[PDB]
Amino acid sequence: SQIPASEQETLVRPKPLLLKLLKSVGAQKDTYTMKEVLFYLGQYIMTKRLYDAAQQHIVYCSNDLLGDLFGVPSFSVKEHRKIYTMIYRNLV
Numbered sequence: 001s002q003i004p005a006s007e008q009e010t011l012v013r014p015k016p017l018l019l020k021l022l023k024s025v026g027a028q029k030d031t032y033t034m035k036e037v038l039f040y041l042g043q044y045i046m047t048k049r050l051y052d053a054a055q056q057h058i059v060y061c062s063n064d065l066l067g068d069l070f071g072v073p074s075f076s077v078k079e080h081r082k083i084y085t086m087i088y089r090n091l092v
């Protein structure tokens with residue numbers, strides 16, 4: 001665990017383009033726990049194949065709405081506080 005359980009559990013409201021992303025992989029609500037947002041972001045990453053076998057912990061999100069939302073061309077799945085901060089930029 002890198003992120004406290006209580007923080008993972010908290011209900012959040014995605015801004016519209018993050019909601020678009022979540023809805024494109026089957027999410028059907030306006031509010032989610034951060035853990036739920038992360039689950040659907042993972043579904044999106046795996047669906048769009050934003051990964052590479054040579055660097056298995058890197059999400060390659062350039063030229064993708066996810067990259068626009070997070071403001072980076074790539075990031076490491078191991079850096080959870082950095083991921084949370086990128087999500088917070090996208091919550092109401």
Ligand SMILES: CC(C)(O)c1cc(F)c2c(c1)C(=O)N(Cc1ccc(C#N)cn1)[C@@]2(OCC1(CO)CC1)c1ccc(Cl)cc1
Pocket residue numbers: 038039040041042043045046050051052056057058059077078079080081083084
């Ligand atoms: C192959 C690759 C690049 O290594 C990869 C891709 C991937 F999509 C996931 C992982 C790894 C991984 O470990 N995940 C779980 C995770 C990672 C970090 C945090 C935080 N803070 C929370 N959860 C991901 O989702 C996994 C899954 C849903 O749980 C089945 C679809 C995931 C979710 C969301 C984000 Cl933003 C980033 C990553």
